[PDB]
Symmetry: C2
Subunit: 272 residues, 2 copies
Amino acid sequence: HMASMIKGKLMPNSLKDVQKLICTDNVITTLSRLKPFDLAMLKATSDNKVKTLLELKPFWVNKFNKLRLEKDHIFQFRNPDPQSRADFYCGYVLYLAALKEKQKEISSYYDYLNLSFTTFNCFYAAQEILTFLIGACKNDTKRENIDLLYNFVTSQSTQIQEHKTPGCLLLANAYFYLAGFYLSLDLKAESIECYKECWGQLHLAQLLETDSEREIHNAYFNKGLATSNAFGLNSISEIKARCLDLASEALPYPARNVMEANAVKTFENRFK
Amino acid sequence: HMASMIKGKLMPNSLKDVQKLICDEGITDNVITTLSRLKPFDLAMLKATSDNKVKTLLDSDELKPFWVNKFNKLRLEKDHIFQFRNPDPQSRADFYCGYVLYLAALKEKQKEISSYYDYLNLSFTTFNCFYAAQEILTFLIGACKNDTKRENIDLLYNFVTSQSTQIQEHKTPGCLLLANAYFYLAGFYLSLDLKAESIECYKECWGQLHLAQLLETDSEREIHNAYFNKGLATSNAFGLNSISEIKARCLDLASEALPYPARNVMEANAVKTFENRFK
């Protein structure tokens, strides 16, 4: 039973001393040779008074700039906007670790992905979570499987729109698949509400594109938008055009206008 | 599958409406009166499961007379005269919602588990509610009384160690809570002949007891709230009323593990932790 009470509440005990040592200048050298997983778990799994290791900023700038993509030695991450380099570093490290446990231990795939997403709002943890949930709903197409993915999508929208354009394209992604899920299950009123819902994310990403050059650079590893959407298209206008083209009956002119108005409303107030 | 991917709870749908009303109109005599009419559970999960613009409205200044009025209403069912005291350094709101979710956890304790876990965990992790910590530790300790395996004991040990510093935010009661767990850890290892681990938790238990002494005179409000103004007797397995009695009894029981030099090292470490982090 103990496993069910303790879910995500265990700091590797190799970090007890560093958390004690922290809660200076010798820390800077203690912190500097934990392996990247342990550093990310220290910031992810500490009292909230130690989590304010947000003075140590040159430490994170050096670690952030050593972040590479194994698949492209040319690529280098750009300033992660509003989020700290510490949080982009630690979220991305935990994301990679989750993929490494992907097929050897699933209970760490969940836990690390959850830490990556919930603690540091890492975009890749969001994209990985959504892809797995969509996969779960591809196989088991029941209405309370779709409703669960739907309910997760709506609860995490606002936090996922902190990545602007990629977040909104990610969110438009989930709504499009939700819409196709409800349709096949003959729940056409809800199929419509997610097609309109997907149009609104597409338009808000559209409004935010010019302010998310760095977000798009990091989100797609400087490869553009092709992998942000199931159509492999390179521009949002191609995404909308193909999308309306598939869902014309669910996206009437006024329907597209309500969502576009609401999308402008969030850009109006919540952004800049 | 999905339930394991979406580990903790999600925002309840009754609150998506109140979430809009708050995201448009700031703290309004309108908002303040919708919130006052929400159920205590729904208010607490609203503060626990909202985005950052509702969590910084709820935390705003203008809703603070709201939370103070709600906090003075908090009452003990079986005690008709207990007043909670200011949980400072903590918010009145966070003490309210963490305590509300804790009570919500107990009402689910025997009707549906895993609502016991989720609410208990939210209470502890999101609001660092002392009572959720005590319930969790009591359950983990209970799990090892029934299942005295080295792998359960290590699980309890590693949890106690990972949550040590957060629990000490409760100052004197928090340290007594940890001293209890370390004491039970010490006896579990001893029964299994893991005498190096038994000695190591007796020393940890002495250090928590001594830090409790240093923080006691500074923890009048925490002690008031932690034990519902009934004193320290329920903070320790002996039902004793003072930390000095607790230390004396503990030293009697763990003599061979708490010789003079060992106790002196642990007390020294406690003095450093008190001086650096507390006074």
